[PDB]
Specification:
It is classed as ligase. Keywords: protein-ligand complex, tRNA synthetase. It is a single chain. By secondary structure, this protein is an alpha+beta fold. Among the domains are: 628-806, Isoleucyl-tRNA Synthetase, Domain 1; 811-868, Ubiquitin-like (UB roll) (Roll), CATH 3.10.20. The longest helix has 24 residues, at 708-731. It is globular. Bound molecules: the ligand CC(C)C[C@H](N)C(=O)OP(=O)(O)OC[C@H]1O[C@@H](n2cnc3c(N)ncnc32)[C@H](O)[C@@H]1O, adenosine-5'-triphosphate, magnesium ion and zinc ion (ZN). The ligand CC(C)C[C@H](N)C(=O)OP(=O)(O)OC[C@H]1O[C@@H](n2cnc3c(N)ncnc32)[C@H](O)[C@@H]1O binds at residues 40-43, 51-52, 54-55, 80, 510, 543-544, 546-547, 551, 580, 582-583, 628-630.
């Protein structure tokens, strides 16, 4: 054994040993219990940083723990390769997005290989390869003919100067990001997944996910946004019907989740596009100006909760069907034409939005709910005004005194008897719009024929291959300017036709890649039946909370679609979910000549303290704040530079030790140093042990006759094994597991293990320590193991707990009656004061000197004495 720890030498050797043994290349082996651990695959945008590394080290820790316990572990990696990163680089470096993507994949793969993750690289997928995306093109065509995928006009952000569609993230105060031109709201045909048809299933199946963080489930529930409410129709008054046609001349229909407050409605409000708004605005130019300002605004809910709610009265009136009140119709900018009826009722006394609205315009507030003895001040809003659970109705005639659910059910029966309303369920969830007007994405497998319409490409003709010899420039999608791509024949009639040139939302690739890993070379379907049946569901998923809503919802949706197609037989894709905390790091920059400032990477700066200078120009730089490690502020620490300086094991150890996995983790030079020093200590410990006599048979079995100090070391040892097993398996708290092993080594260091029995216990401790830590730092542990023991580490398995090592020795306690010694008892070291009392009262000499008299008091001195006063 070499005396000094040399990571640069032993880590490549360990990785080659693991690669040669194929321990991470797994099949569908029925002779082993399966375990599928999955980390969210990265966008191949250039270079991974230590943030990504924390995510993938956590998954590798869990994967190696399960492997040591005899599981058939699949831990796959792959590349979420489509999307805008490459398209921007194509404009920047004037390179094809495909070529840029593959160059990044190759570099990042070596980044990952250098870290020694136990990954099945034979299952690697890159989602921009036709062999992958053909199968989501396939599922698209199957769902299209079922109507689950459909085509309809939707609204987009049209930049007339750049001649491109833009996301809402790129429209700023109504103008494009790179243009500043007024964006036009344009209606174009697009493709949608009818995810609303699955809303109730997607909502209710969250209850099955007993091992998901509650916040993630809460966020999905709020996103789906189911509500149980009431459709309510207000008869349009006879004087308010001019210019109204059909049903709009008859009633105003609204949706409310508070039908128990319908007796308290004081006005109603309609969207600017509502037919009542249009008719009243006919002769009123003030109503036209307000309607125009509404439609010109952004309907995004982010801008709308921060929006000043405004309205104008219309002079039109409707009649409350429960009490006959004549209520004026207002046009209001908060009423959305597309959610429900585009019209709402207003109850200012019991909804905070209606209270503030009616406080601005001095509209009536009528109390219909009392909550105990709480006083109702019509000029101030109180949190109990909206309490659904603890209130009963007042000023409601038939309904007085009922609670929320009783009044709900009563108003439902009343309105249905009058034909003026009925219960209705709504969802905030909208259908999922697939279409993107971008080049670097999966082509939509639709052909447009003037005779046959929008027809799907037949399964025999899939994939529609995205051409990779393309350099986009930002003046519209290049597919729309390539007749060699879009000119084709119609698959139904054979006539001349045109391919759809929009591509798919790249969330599509990530909505099913976890099934593709199960059979990534299968060419008869998305996932082979035998492999899906073997691997079942992902046992463990690890990824950032930024994907807890959309990605997770889409993946759960695809799972159910694939189930209903007969491709898989699980309802849910991910059984356990771990959301790792973000790695954060200080930033640095300097102001550029073009006004705006540009950011400098940490490893390119030099910091002196008690000046911050650029490591190249030797000029000082700005030392700004600490935030999430990312490419935007260029504060990503490249693992490869850390590995060159300290080794992969030092990188993995720092990430797993510095913080609980869910807690944010601040980059620290001192923290990296503390990990290396521990690895030196670990190496030093095994070397000095083998120096002083060489390897021996590890102690096992009956420990009677072992010295007190060695019994205590074995007690610490097997307590540590139980603890680390619980931290890895149940708690998933890796920082405390490492601390536990460090405590074992501290006690080892304080124990004389020179004797024959001392060496056997020393062998037992070190053999356990190196296996306990192997999921965290497998390179040094693999090498140290082989110097300790000739068996294969993965065949020796996870360390077992010796329960006999956890039994402490028994105590002898004196039993006195009225202070005079009358007997002796033998008690457990863990015996409570009540067990000491019981054993003492049952001592022969105690009962023979208590003379049947009861005990007036019993003094218990643990470990020394029990005195029975009688
Ligand atoms: C399933 C797909 C939709 C996933 C998509 N391709 C994606 O998110 O890919 P991306 O490459 O962006 O990130 C890959 C993983 O790394 C995590 N991550 C990134 N930065 C940090 C950081 N500073 N600290 C901690 N963790 C971080 C991030 O949460 C994610 O789980
Ligand atoms: N088109 C619409 N635009 C704006 N608000 C609407 C629209 N349709 C209904 N509403 C209002 O939204 C209220 C509640 O609907 P929803 O469940 O979507 O929201 P919420 O705030 O989550 O629910 P709640 O008020 O019960 O807590 C209804 O009572 C109604 O007054
Ligand atoms: Mg269950
Ligand atoms: Zn045709």
């Amino acid at each position: 054994m070499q005396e000094h720890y040399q990571p640069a030498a032993i880590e490549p050797a360990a990785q080659k040993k693991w690669d040669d043994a194929r321990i991470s290349n797994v099949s569908e082996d029925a002779s082993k219990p399966k375990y599928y651990c999955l980390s969210m695959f990265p966008y191949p945008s250039g270079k991974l940083h230590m943030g990504h590394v924390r995510n993938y080290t956590i998954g590798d820790v869990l994967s190696r723990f399960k492997l040591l316990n005899g599981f058939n572990v699949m831990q796959p990696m792959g590349w979420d390769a489509f999307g805008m990163p490459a398209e921007n680089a194509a404009m920047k470096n004037n390179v094809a997005p495909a070529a840029w993507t593959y160059d990044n994949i190759e570099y990042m793969k070596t980044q990952l290989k250098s870290l020694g993750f136990a990954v099945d690289w034979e299952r690697e997928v890159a989602t921009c390869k036709p062999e992958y995306y053909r199968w989501e093109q396939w599922l698209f065509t199957k769902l299209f003919e079922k109507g689950i995928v459909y085509r309809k006009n939707g609204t987009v952000n049209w930049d007339p100067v750049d001649q491109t569609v833009l996301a809402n993230e790129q429209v700023i105060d109504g103008r494009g990001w790179r243009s500043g031109a007024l964006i036009e709201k344009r209606e174009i045909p697009m493709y949608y997944f009818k995810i609303t048809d699955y809303a109730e299933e997607l909502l209710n199946d969250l209850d099955k996910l007993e091992h998901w963080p509650e916040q993630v489930k809460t966020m999905q529930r709020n996103w789906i946004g189911k509500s149980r409410g009431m459709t309510v129709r207000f008869a349009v008054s006879d004087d308010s019907k001019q210019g109204l046609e059909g049903d709009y001349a008859k009633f105003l229909q609204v949706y409310t989740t508070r039908p128990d407050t319908l007796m308290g409605a004081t006005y109603v409000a309609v969207a600017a596009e509502h037919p009542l708004a249009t008719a009243a605005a006919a002769d009123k130019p003030e109503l036209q100006a307000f309607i125009a300002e509404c439609k010109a605004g952004s309907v995004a809910e982010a801008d709308m909760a921060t929006m000043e709610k405004k309205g104008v009265p219309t002079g039109r009136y409707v009649v409350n069907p429960l009490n006959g009140d004549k209520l004026e119709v207002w046009i209001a900018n908060y009423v959305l034409w597309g959610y429900g009826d585009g019209a709402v009722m207003a109850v200012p006394a019991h909804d905070e939005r209606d209270f503030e609205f009616a406080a601005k315009y001095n509209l009536p507030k009528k109390q219909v709910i009392a909550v105990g003895d709480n006083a109702f001040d019509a000029n101030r809003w109180q949190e109990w005004y909206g309490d659904k659970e603890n209130g009963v109705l007042v000023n409601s005639g038939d309904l007085d005194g009922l609670d929320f659910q009783t009044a709900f059910d009563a108003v439902a029966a009343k309105l249905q008897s009058q034909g003026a309303g009925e219960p209705k369920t709504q969802y905030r969830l909208r259908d999922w719009g697939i279409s993107r007007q971008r080049y670097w994405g999966c082509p939509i497998p639709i052909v447009h024929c003037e005779k046959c319409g929008n027809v799907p490409v037949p399964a025999d003709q899939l994939p529609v291959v995205l051409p990779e010899n393309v350099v986009p420039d930002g003046m519209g999608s290049p597919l729309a300017k390539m007749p060699e791509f879009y000119e084709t024949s119609c698959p139904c009639c054979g006539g001349a036709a045109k391919r759809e040139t929009d591509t798919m939302d790249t969330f599509i690739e990530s909505s099913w890649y976890f099934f593709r890993y199960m059979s990534p070379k299968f060419s008869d379907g998305m996932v082979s039946a035998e492999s899906a049946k073997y691997w079942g569901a992902v046992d463990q998923y690890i990824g950032g909370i930024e994907h807890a809503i959309l990605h997770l919802l889409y993946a759960r949706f695809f799972t159910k679609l694939m189930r209903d197609e007969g491709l898989v037989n699980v309802d849910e894709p991910f059984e356990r979910l771990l959301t790792q905390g973000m790695v954060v790091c200080e930033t640095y920059y300097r102001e550029n000549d073009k006004g705006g400032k540009d950011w400098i990477n940490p490893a390119d700066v030099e910091l002196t303290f008690d000046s911050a200078v650029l490591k190249a120009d030797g000029l000082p730089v700005v030392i700004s704040g600490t935030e999430k490690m990312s490419k935007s502020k260029n504060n990503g620490v490249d693992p490869q530079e850390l590995i060159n300086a300290y080794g992969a094991d030092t990188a993995r150890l720092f990430m797993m030790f510095a913080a609980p996995p869910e807690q944010s983790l601040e980059w620290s030079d001192s923290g990296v140093e503390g990990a290396h020093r521990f690895l030196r200590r670990l190496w030093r410990t095994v070397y000095e042990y083998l120096k002083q006599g060489g390897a021996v048979k590890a102690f096992a079995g009956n420990q009677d006759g072992l010295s007190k100090e060695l019994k205590d070391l074995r007690h610490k040892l097997h307590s540590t094994t139980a603890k680390v097993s619980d931290d890895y398996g149940r708690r998933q708290q890796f920082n405390t597991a490492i601390a536990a092993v460090m405590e074992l080594l501290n006690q080892y260091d304080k124990t004389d293990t020179g004797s024959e029995q001392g060496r056997a216990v020393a062998q037992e401790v070190l053999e356990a320590a190196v296996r306990l830590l192997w999921p965290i730092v497998p390179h040094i542990c693999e090498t140290l193991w082989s110097e300790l023991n000739g068996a294969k580490l993965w065949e020796a398995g996870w360390p077992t707990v010796d329960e006999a090592a956890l039994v402490k020795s028994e105590i002898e306690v004196m039993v006195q009656v009225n202070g005079k010694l009358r007997g002796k008892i033998t008690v457990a070291a863990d015996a409570s004061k009540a067990d000491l009392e019981a054993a003492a009262l049952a001592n022969e000499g105690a009962v023979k000197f208590m003379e049947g008299k009861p005990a007036k008091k019993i003094i218990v001195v643990p470990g020394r004495l029990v005195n029975i006063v009688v």
